[PDB]
């Protein structure tokens, strides 16, 4: 009958393979993603701390230059970048860690949840390196770290930390040391019975 394109066929076959294959625990805990409410609240705080864009950064630089022509504190902003965030976690400067679930070299992340766990910093895995890259003003980001925020949101930072470290951390902590997969369908069951 009809013939599908090569790349489309390959891509659907790859999703079938990912959902069929027996998954090691790292990629399994990658598969286990958090919930909508936690994602939304984290995105709210992260948006209130989104980094300055290039237009307004140059605008404030020109502001300062004109002020020099004719007094601040440390900027608190979300830290982004794989190496920067892993160093921050190693130095225990991070308060919360958010990890993209779809890093297409997956080795870039395999060790990150485990290092976060041992270090002690709470971590979560969210859907969309695209959302990470939109939290920052980029196209994509692998990891997102919250280290320190201003006074007004100490309370909500701590509340979000407690909410994640209980309601996602324990929930996916009871079951994360196993192997995933095993989603065989009806035709798969019949084929295995016949085999």
């Amino acid at each position: 009958m009809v013939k599908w394109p090569e790349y489309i066929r390959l891509q659907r076959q790859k999703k079938i393979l990912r959902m069929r294959l027996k998954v090691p625990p790292a990629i399994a805990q990658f598969q286990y993603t958090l919930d909508k409410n936690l994602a939304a609240q984290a995105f709210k705080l992260l948006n209130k701390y989104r980094p300055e864009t290039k237009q307004e950064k140059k605008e404030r630089l020109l502001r300062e230059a004109t002020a020099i022509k004719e007094v601040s504190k440390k900027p608190y902003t979300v830290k982004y970048g794989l190496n920067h965030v892993v160093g921050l976690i190693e130095n225990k400067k991070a308060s919360l860690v958010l990890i993209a679930n779809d890093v297409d070299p997956i080795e870039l992340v395999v060790f990150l949840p485990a290092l976060c766990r041992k270090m002690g910093i709470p971590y979560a895995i969210i859907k969309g390196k695209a959302r990470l890259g939109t939290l920052v003003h980029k196209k994509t980001a692998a990891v997102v770290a919250i280290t320190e925020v201003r006074s007004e949101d100490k309370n909500e930072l701590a509340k979000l930390i407690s909410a994640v470290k209980e309601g996602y951390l324990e929930k996916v902590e009871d079951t994360r040391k196993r192997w995933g997969g095993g989603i065989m369908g009806f035709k798969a069951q019949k084929r295995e019975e016949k085999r």
């Binding site: 393979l17 870039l108 990150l112």
Partner: protein, 183 residues
Amino acid sequence: GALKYLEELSKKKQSDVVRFLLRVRCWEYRQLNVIHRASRPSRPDKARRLGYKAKQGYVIYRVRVRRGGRQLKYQRSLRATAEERVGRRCSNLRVLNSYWVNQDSTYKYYEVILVDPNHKAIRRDPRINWICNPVHKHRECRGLTSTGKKSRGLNKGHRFNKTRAGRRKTWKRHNTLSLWRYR
């Protein structure tokens, strides 16, 4: 630190997670063509230590080559063969380097880092204008890459007496009959 962790993974590449990843990627490579383009490397740590840069003009090409005997063994390594095939494919680029990425029971898989000599970012960067220079045309063909040096025995010591300065040049130098004016 992430590159250090990746280096440790590549060290324990026979582990469970790495074996799974190489299995899936081997299936993907078999499904794709013999030679194909990667904008981003499969092993970023290895690419970075070999010299890959996140710049306009650096590309990765992934290539599969038949493995086994040629009982006469083909003296050129499969890495060199892959680099040479990449050269004939894109003769415009310059072969910066190459690294093994995967292997199968019939094909061995390599990723080659290539540099564009006609892009003015590459011209400006004074760490890469050396390969912008015309002396480095077809380094893979002249055996000037790492595999070329390894196969040519370009090392120091008494173990490499015959090849440290060029095998054929050493042969010629030893077999020339020099005759001076005052003999």
